[PDB]
Write a protein that binds this ligand. Sequence first.
Ligand SMILES: O=C1c2cccc3[nH]nc(c23)CCN1[C@@H]1CN2CCC1CC2
Ligand SMILES: O=C1c2cccc3[nH]nc(c23)CCN1[C@@H]1CN2CCC1CC2
Ligand SMILES: O=C1c2cccc3[nH]nc(c23)CCN1[C@@H]1CN2CCC1CC2
Lengths: 395, 395, 395, 395, 395
Amino acid sequence: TTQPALLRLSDHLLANYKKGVRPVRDWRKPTTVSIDVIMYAILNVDEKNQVLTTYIWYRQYWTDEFLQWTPEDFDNVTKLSIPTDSIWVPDILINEFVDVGKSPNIPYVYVHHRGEVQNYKPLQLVTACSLDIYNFPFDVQNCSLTFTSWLHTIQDINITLWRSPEEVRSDKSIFINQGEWELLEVFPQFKEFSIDISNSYAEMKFYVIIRRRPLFYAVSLLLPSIFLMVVDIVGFCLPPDSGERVSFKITLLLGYSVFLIIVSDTLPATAIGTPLIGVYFVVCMALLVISLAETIFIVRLVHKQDLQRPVPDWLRHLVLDRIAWILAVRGLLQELSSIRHFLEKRDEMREVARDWLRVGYVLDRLLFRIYLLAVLAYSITLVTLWSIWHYSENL
Amino acid sequence: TTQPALLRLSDHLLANYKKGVRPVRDWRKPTTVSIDVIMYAILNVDEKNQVLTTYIWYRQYWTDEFLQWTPEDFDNVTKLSIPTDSIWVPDILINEFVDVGKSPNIPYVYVHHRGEVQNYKPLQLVTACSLDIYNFPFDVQNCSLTFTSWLHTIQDINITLWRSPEEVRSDKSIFINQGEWELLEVFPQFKEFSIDISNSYAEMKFYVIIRRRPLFYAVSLLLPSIFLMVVDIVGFCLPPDSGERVSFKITLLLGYSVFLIIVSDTLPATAIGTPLIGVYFVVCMALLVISLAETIFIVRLVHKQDLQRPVPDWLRHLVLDRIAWILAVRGLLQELSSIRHFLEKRDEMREVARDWLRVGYVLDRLLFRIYLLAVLAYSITLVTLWSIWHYSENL
Amino acid sequence: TTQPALLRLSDHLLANYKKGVRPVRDWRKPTTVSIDVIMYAILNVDEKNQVLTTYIWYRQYWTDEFLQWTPEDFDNVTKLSIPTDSIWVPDILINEFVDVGKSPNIPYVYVHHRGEVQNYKPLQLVTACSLDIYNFPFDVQNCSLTFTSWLHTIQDINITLWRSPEEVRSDKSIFINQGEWELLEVFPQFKEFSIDISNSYAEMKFYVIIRRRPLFYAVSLLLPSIFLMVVDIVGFCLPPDSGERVSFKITLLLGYSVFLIIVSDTLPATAIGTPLIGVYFVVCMALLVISLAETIFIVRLVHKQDLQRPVPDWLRHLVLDRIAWILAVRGLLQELSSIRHFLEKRDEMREVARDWLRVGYVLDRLLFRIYLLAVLAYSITLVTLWSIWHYSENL
Amino acid sequence: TTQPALLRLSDHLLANYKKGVRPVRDWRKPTTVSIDVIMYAILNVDEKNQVLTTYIWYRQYWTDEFLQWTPEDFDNVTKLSIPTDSIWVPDILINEFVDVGKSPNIPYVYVHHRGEVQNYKPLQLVTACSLDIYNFPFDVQNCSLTFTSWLHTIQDINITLWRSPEEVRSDKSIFINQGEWELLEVFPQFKEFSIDISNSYAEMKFYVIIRRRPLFYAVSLLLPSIFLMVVDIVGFCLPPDSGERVSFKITLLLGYSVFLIIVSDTLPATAIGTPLIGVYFVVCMALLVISLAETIFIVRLVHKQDLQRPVPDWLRHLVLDRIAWILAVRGLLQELSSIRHFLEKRDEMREVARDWLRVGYVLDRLLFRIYLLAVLAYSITLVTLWSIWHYSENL
Amino acid sequence: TTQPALLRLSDHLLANYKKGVRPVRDWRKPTTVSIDVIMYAILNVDEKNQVLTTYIWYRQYWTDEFLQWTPEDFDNVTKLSIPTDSIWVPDILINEFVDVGKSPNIPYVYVHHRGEVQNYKPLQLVTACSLDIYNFPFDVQNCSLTFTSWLHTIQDINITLWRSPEEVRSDKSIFINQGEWELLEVFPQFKEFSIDISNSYAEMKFYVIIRRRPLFYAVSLLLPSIFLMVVDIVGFCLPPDSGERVSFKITLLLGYSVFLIIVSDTLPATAIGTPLIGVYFVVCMALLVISLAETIFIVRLVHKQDLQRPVPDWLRHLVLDRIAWILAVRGLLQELSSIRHFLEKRDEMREVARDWLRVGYVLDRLLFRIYLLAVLAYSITLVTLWSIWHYSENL
Ligand SMILES: O=C1c2cccc3[nH]nc(c23)CCN1[C@@H]1CN2CCC1CC2
Ligand SMILES: O=C1c2cccc3[nH]nc(c23)CCN1[C@@H]1CN2CCC1CC2
Ligand SMILES: O=C1c2cccc3[nH]nc(c23)CCN1[C@@H]1CN2CCC1CC2
């Protein structure tokens, strides 16, 4: 009577109570813990080592059947807070743990009448996910979390949800914005696990769908690459100025290399595969340097005064292409004759060499048409990728 | 009597006292903890992962109503220090915790008569903030801290301030100088939190305003970029020396690229957006390389002796631009005739080609005027940014 | 009777039981712990410091001979869970530990009748392995783990397997896919260790075979290097255009250098040796720059009008190569004579210099044949490497 | 008697003794702890985040007035070692703590008669200092440490020195050599701290003076920069070979850029200011590129055959500079006349253009004299910096 | 009798035994702990912060004189294992500790009769060593470890070796191969330490000799640098083709710069000094760029038609070098005279300019001989370095 209600209740409950045993009056009936998880934020995502870092708010509740008392004797007190180190605590944790999680400690738990026990805690989960960068700008990731007791079997601990699944699937009330990645949904699913028959352990599967935000990467990658893509408009109806034109084209190639290496060194870290953007980048440059090689080989072969190939080989190339397509006065007089030939040999040879440059000219415009076809294919596959992303958001 | 006062008081108080329960004689009345926070320093700010690291000095006080004694019996002692592990300690912490905070431990607390209990501690807070780099040189950040009990509700623990808010808003007595970022104000605000009706948890909001120092970044970015901006004075009344001038302009472009890549690789780490300085940088270079492309296309098209376009297309371009603007002796005689034409063909063709370079010249000065307009817009938007920063300091 | 079975059994067992001693009723008989390890994933592999990070699921079982009771008295309960801090736990650990392993804690253990005690735990092993990068694209690694008691001898603790070794050798039921490295087999072997006679300590050897996946590295290294390998097709029947050809070849060398340095700076981290790919890369470039040096030396030596070496040295080089192979009218008349020689000296000297370029031409095609032989050797050694890898998978 | 002296003394002292209270028989008299710190090494200094890492050996002593006994009864034992967890330990620590310090634990303390208690410990201090890089090669830093009790006031704990300050100021007996930074002095000073009147807390200020070693940085920076500074000797009496000279000067500029960027990327990390060496580096390059711009503008303006500016503007520039300084036979005859002018127009125009290059030449030598003046100023300010450093060592 | 021997012995020994005091029956006699250390591996060595990371196996033994019993009463049991937290443990540790060492815990210790107590533990030591990179490829390091009690004096704890020193000096039975660094010897030495007279603390010095493996660094540094060293064979009997030769030499310089910067950025991290290889690298490049400067200055000074220096200065340079060495028909006739001079002025001036290039040629071959002398000095100092390394292995 003189003692306060809280101290009397704590003395009546915590006394002569052994921790470390399952609080069930009959050993056959298993205890059922129920859990609930709320998304807070995605701290960091990296694809060099397949590591996902997230932050969850976790709450669990179960029945501690030893902790019962009559509220009518204890001055109407239907609430109690006790240290978490003095009662039973189940070992429910995630199946994979690349680290400890460096979780803070909350050393208080709730105790209602009729044995209800609740526990709240924040958790920082660092795990491993099967990340893929098949579609880099428009990426969706399906990660998994597995809540399971590491030692107890299905005859001891079973897992259940606090709320209906439909409410869990839509949870954005706590997720903070201004982040690189955003939550789409969380899906719970009850599975049964077993590796070796004798024992069957319970399981709780949480599927998380995460979608990237293609704004900063899109702006920093697609816009400036397309803008510096100027060989398309330069190579249209190319003149025979290749000699100095490809000198500047090789300068431009050096600039492109710089642009390719800074981007490669900073953004991609996929160690198992390649995005489609990278391989199409690669093949576009492949046939650009090939166009360079053809347009330098032509001018180098016609450069000299040997008129390219005077042997019957150009006609063969043409026909195969078509098939696959389907005294003193005497001295002064002799003086006159020697002058003319020298005065007109130079410009004649120069103009004959220059006139062979239509043979020079051919076939580069054709592979330019092939380049335009490749550009159109790249644009249409980007459009289809955006369409795939739009379907990906259909949830 | 023979025993000293301190040991007698400690024996009288710490004995038969159960920790882990709320020290209230009636369970209905909630206990009220009050807090106080002082800024020390901003350790590190990075925008790659939205992480803020700060250092605070924290003090809290409340009423431990079990710890009461009469000073007239205990030889006039109105002060007491006891270990912090032997009494009740509330679980007031910040809502977000990207890490533990790696806080040191101070295992002593104050105990006055009439149940007053005070606690001092230093805290190293590492949190997540909605950082934005919309205005890079002149940046202001509004971060938030949320002191809240992780388990107890509003019927158990309520939060209050030790001092008046106006004193808290101006606190620079401890903040150390010589740092990259500086404190502006700290604002407390009492909110009520609830996610699900049944329970309502208290809350304590601390809004921190942090302003950057634009000295080293300004000196290292705006001054040398403006100084190496010399194409403005080079491109004024450009002569027809473009052939070798744009060879050196492409060299200058390579140098600019180097300057752009070292800066890009080191300073910016925004993964969600772009500052205005970056995009204006981008568009200025965009139309600089466009000026390069036009001034090389012109000289390459007039380079050869085909007099550019002898077809009626230049007149069309001009009119569309205007609309949008709104025996022996006989042999010696025949010898004379052949000489002259050859002796005067070369210089004539050269001078006719050179004379077509006014048509060559046009329209680059016009896009140079467009460049000057862009430069003026950049300067005026920098001025307006500085004005926005001056308003931002108005607090 | 009134008390539940679990509490009565825990009180009967845990009471008056001293931990920290070996639970054997006769001290002569040693206790035998048995272990079992399952692969989960390979977290990270790096060759800069010879560090291997893995994840294992570990279970051990032994006989705690003090913990015995009759199930017929205790209401048929053949299962028990007790805290792991209240009984004896052997100190079985790995011999090498570059770090602690940052393992989570599972504070519950199983206790059956007749003294059976089982323990489950996850372990994150970070160790040191004798990694070799002799064969980089097609690599196989043989790491070792050594389970051993750090203090107890063979007269106290002996190690045994739970299951037959043949089942342990094939374990892929838990290993997660989508990783850089994949498991091949785990092999257990019982060894006896001793450094100094007096004492003999037991040991448990686990040999792990890990095979790399050559997809992303192969695509990013062999395909683009082979594609940019174009000097092979350029250098075939090289013309005497070397003057500007090697100017572009040196440009290409600069590009190759860039390609070599980004790759070197990012992928290889071997600090003790070299892969065969690197050294063959090195020697191929060696003789490419040597071809460059020869083809510039030739054109520089024949460049001037000194006709290369008019001294009898070229014949010596040829023979050593073959051996190792096994008044007024008079004034006008005098005017005529002076003109001709000047009008025909220039082109004559030019054509004589040009005609000496067959001597110029020789021997570069021969070292080109040597280059082709080196390329063939590189291809055939790559084929043999793939064949070695195919044998390596034979397990 | 039969029991040994040590066990009897430990039983007599440690028994019935309450820890967690101040060991003073009268509560009014404060206890006085005294400290002593010895420098060991400076582990790491970085200016990106203002972090100082040091290593100290710390010893403290005070009077535990409860721990007294008569040595004449306890078999002459004037020395005792007891665990540090069983008695009172003051909470004296440093005011700033960017981390915990990761200090090892020494769980033994000394206990003499008459209550003397001593404690030895090593500490690894990581703190924040107001680092400045105003004078980079010749730098001196003044860091501060503040030993203070985090909770107790001046009426409870006071701080004193073990030894005289003069001995503390000279302490190099433990400092290890072969380090980047070296100790100069440690200065103790007793301050009184208070933020809010009611309470006054004690304080112990340790000022540390640290001086850098300018050997490796000096060798790697000043010697090679001065050596590659060759434009000074090249630009002396510059000839009119600017056309190809500034082509190589721009090549040299590229090399200088490389030298500037590797150094910038590796050594400086000041985020708040600039050293004088950097700004003088910047201004020297500023007017070097300005000399480049002037010497290219001149040759480009005189390049063409328009004789630079034939308009009366060069005279204006000169005067402003001075002010600021303070049938058949007829056909053959007509044939002769046409030849001469063509045969002598070319070389005449060439020589007239070449002769205008004295006007070309002027004023670059004058700005070269300005460059020499800047070089002399740089040398003299380096000399004055060395003199400042020599005064800085005066201690 | 009914109770087992182990439990009876543990109850008889661990009961009524106070830990935290020195187990000596007379306080005057000091206790003597003996230690033994075995090398396992060298985890990481870096010279940016003078940090050494090693792994040791440590065992200590001493006499716990309270723990004695008669084996004839306790059923012949001469072996015992007890937890390490229940008895006295000396605080023997290393003097320097840049970190904690993150050592695992082995909570069991051996106890024989007659008070013998042994303890085994693995230790991961991270320390500070006076590393020097004076001789980079052929380096030997002499590190020190100091086992000492941090609180107890020579009157309480003395250090001794378990085995003879000669056996300790040769210990390679546990060291793992395939590492960057290898063990040479470990040398123990007994020192006496004192800083301040009153007290004298014991000490145990372990000198470790570590020798690098010069295979990967040698292959990656000396072979390719020597191979790309081709200016030696190019500069031999240099022709007057310098104009384009030094254009390619400056290209080669750019390539050398790239080679120098990647290597500098990756391998060296010495912050206090320089290796001899670096400074000889520096001086070789110094006089290579000086050769470049001389050979460009010569050709630029003779480039124009001013015949270099027609002033009497070349003779002065030569002599100082030698000293330091120790009507109509009239019109047609006038027409003839004007032709000849123009027809023969050009080639005459060209050949006179070309003929002045022997004066052009001199002195570069002489500084080439100086280069060859420098190369020979570099080779001979490398040979002497290898000889020093061979003596260094003499142990
Ligand atoms: O995490 C949850 C939480 C978890 C799981 C289910 C939940 N429903 N409603 C909530 C909640 C809200 C309660 N908190 C937090 C924990 N304390 C501090 C912050 C919130 C308020 C009480
Ligand atoms: O470290 C030592 C060791 C230390 C110091 C001296 C030593 N002599 N002989 C040895 C040893 C061998 C014993 N182990 C190890 C510790 N346990 C696990 C591995 C070894 C066997 C027992
Ligand atoms: O740190 C100090 C020390 C501190 C403060 C004052 C000091 N005076 N003399 C010393 C010392 C020397 C004592 N040690 C060390 C601590 N143990 C291991 C190494 C030394 C010897 C005893």
